Amino acid sequence: ANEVNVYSYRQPYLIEPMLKNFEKDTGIKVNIIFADKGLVDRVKQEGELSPADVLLTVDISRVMEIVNADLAQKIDSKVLEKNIPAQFRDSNDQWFGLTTRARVIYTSKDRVGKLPAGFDYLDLAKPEYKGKVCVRSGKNSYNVSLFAAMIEHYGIEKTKAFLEGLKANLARKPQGGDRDQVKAIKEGICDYSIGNSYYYGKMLDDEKQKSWAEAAIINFPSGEHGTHKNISGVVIAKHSPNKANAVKLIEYLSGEKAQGLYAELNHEYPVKEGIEPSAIVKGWGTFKSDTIKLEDIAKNYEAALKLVDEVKFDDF
């Protein structure tokens, strides 16, 4: 066959455009399965008979789970070397970042306005925000990786206290995704949410959700450690049965065209130097990105997940 088998943690609407362009431009057929969980364990249990070629991630911690479990292989590509800056790929060539995203704080336009300079994630645990914060499941990987970064910066005790305070301030039982929290802001249920940056652009582009975005302000935390960054990523599976095609896919996704699609269609930040963000994303302005090393986020993921369970974050 002339195919590549993709296991995707990315949502269809945020990856199918790139994959369809890849199919058209290369002639390689994409077979894709989607999930929110269980794909790493699936590759592991499938073992040497796994058909997986490419694992698409939305989180550095998932990437490292795959790589640490010896489920990846090293890819030595001059195309990836050129297209992906070194800070967004494994020094040992087993994973590759394709975009970055910020986990931001959305606020009610009407009831909060823009956050002041210096506002940090930690501030969301302060008693003045009781009943005013919406967050999706604390066990969602975007949240766990944020909390993992917080462990690196503040330690486990202060991060646990933060999670207790954040939980205490929730306006409702964690439910829905990042966009749904912004709907809740629009409807007046909460005044603050945590969510990824690109969703704001997706909502603005959606006729049914632009009113949600219009009721909210995107804020990039500007405390000591700035705004949390994470990546969409990719690994080629250890036993990739269509490895040449897999390499062609990840090389394609790293290229000028696909990076432009990530920027323009997804409102993510491309990794490739020289590729501009969308007009919407540019309009948000710049911000201070956390300088934490991507691997040091992942290092703390399991501890962060344990904290989320300990504080029973999702139990209202």
Ligand SMILES: [Fe+3]
């Ligand atoms: Fe996402």
